[PDB]
């Protein structure tokens, strides 16, 4: 992070051991279940690109995923270099500077505390999360079309499986609307499926679950 | 680390017990798997050479690795002595290693104008030793990493790239390995599914092609 020191200079604050051990535990245990991305984003808060690189370098497992993440960051950095041509009070960051490969920490804090700020920490955090989105979609164990309710399974446990898969697969919202309206009904077991159709098209998830609660 | 006291003076903040316990547990559990080096570099941010020496002294096991580290630090210190010939007292290599220097010299150097960042310079010499240690403690060569007859390709690429990260060849050797060993050492089910893509395929294309195999 960044903190104004006792002399009033904008100075780096080290990413704490608690934050790194939390992030490592999260990634090694949850294995790109979608919770990894909001937990990254929370532990990331205020990070410079050097701090973000510290988090990503400290991950020990999933090195195939970390290479897909690195390839995504390289794609985003190259797209930045395409969308922002290089210039013919301070340097203007190339994609490798935002990714923190060609920028010093004092350049990173320079940009992040400039007026206006050039928030290379937030820009790079977006490129990381764009890589993690693709990874979390890939690490989904099931497609939503193969999530269906067992003959004795509670509609609550099936909905939990459905929406966890729907969150991981992360289709467009129009497709999530289509899946939650049509497939959640269509893939319910025959005892629930009739109840769910009886409510008609407008039923909320609360109405569907409270109607199926006893089945 | 270095902090400013309420008197407005540059003062040593002691490396905390919890940071040391984290470092000790990291080294003793992960046994110079490559993630030890970024974890070291993260735990040692702002460290003086006295702090870095505290971290390296507190490692109980792996004394063969710690001697490879010590002799690497001696090599780097001798090269610093040559790259910066003898003329705030300018540091010799042993001073940056924190052997011949007081803590007050270390803080003086790290807070001079211009600063002489002996904590960062020494952290570089430590990480240059840890690189060689991590390469050596790599348990198998990348030539030995092969996919089992029923092993998911995703687990095989995790093993491949963890080995590739530890063995840490130059980028063109990594290019050749990721292009051609990774394909060749896949099992007979995946190997054709990979060859179907053509040789330019990215890792995500390979992992999505083999996804169910």
């Amino acid at each position: 992070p960044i903190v104004q020191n006792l002399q009033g200079q904008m100075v780096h604050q080290a990413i704490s051991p608690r934050t790194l051990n939390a992030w490592v535990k999260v990634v090694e245990e949850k294995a790109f279940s979608p919770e990894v991305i909001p937990m990254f984003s929370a532990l990331s808060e205020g990070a410079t690109p050097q701090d973000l690189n510290t988090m990503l370098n400290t991950v020990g497992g999933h090195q195939a995923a970390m290479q897909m993440l690195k390839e995504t960051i390289n794609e985003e950095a190259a797209e930045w270099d395409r969308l922002h041509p290089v210039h013919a009070q301070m340097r203007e960051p190339r994609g490798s500077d935002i990714a923190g490969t060609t920028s010093t920490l004092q350049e990173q804090i320079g940009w992040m505390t400039h007026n206006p700020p050039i928030p290379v920490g937030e820009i790079y955090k977006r490129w990381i999360i764009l890589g993690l989105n693709k990874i979390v979609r890939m690490y989904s164990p099931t497609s939503i079309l193969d999530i269906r309710q067992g003959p004795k399974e509670p509609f609550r446990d099936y909905v939990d499986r459905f929406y966890k898969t729907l969150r991981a697969e992360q289709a467009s919202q129009e497709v999530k609307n289509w899946m939650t309206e049509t497939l959640l009904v269509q893939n319910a077991n025959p005892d629930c499926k009739t109840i769910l159709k009886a409510l008609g098209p407008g039923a909320t998830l609360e109405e569907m679950m409270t109607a199926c609660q006893g089945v | 680390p270095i902090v400013q006291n309420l008197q407005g003076q540059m003062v040593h903040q002691a490396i905390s017990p919890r940071t040391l316990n984290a470092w000790v547990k990291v080294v003793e559990e992960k046994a110079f798997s490559p993630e030890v080096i970024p974890m070291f570099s993260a735990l040692s941010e702002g460290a003086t050479p006295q702090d870095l020496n505290t971290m390296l002294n507190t490692v109980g096991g792996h004394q063969a690795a710690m001697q490879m580290l010590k002799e690497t630090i001696n090599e780097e210190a001798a090269e610093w002595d040559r790259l910066h010939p003898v003329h705030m007292r300018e540091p010799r290599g042993s001073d940056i290693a924190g052997t011949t220097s007081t803590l007050q010299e270390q803080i003086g150097w790290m807070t001079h104008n211009p600063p002489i960042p002996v904590g960062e310079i020494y952290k570089r010499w430590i990480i240059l030793g840890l690189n060689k240690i991590v390469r050596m403690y790599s348990p198998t060569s990348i030539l030995d990493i092969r996919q089992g007859p029923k092993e998911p390709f995703r687990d095989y690429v995790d093993r491949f790239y963890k080995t590739l990260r530890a063995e840490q060849a130059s980028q063109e050797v990594k290019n050749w390995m990721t292009e051609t060993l990774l394909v060749q050492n896949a099992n007979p089910d995946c190997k054709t599914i990979l060859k179907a893509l053509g040789p330019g395929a990215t890792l995500e294309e390979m992992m999505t092609a083999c996804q169910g195999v």
Partner: peptide, 12 residues
């Protein structure tokens, strides 16, 4: 020939 280091991201 020296080892290239393990930092996949950032300045290495």
């Amino acid at each position: 020939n020296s080892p290239s280091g393990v930092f996949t991201f950032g300045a290495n």
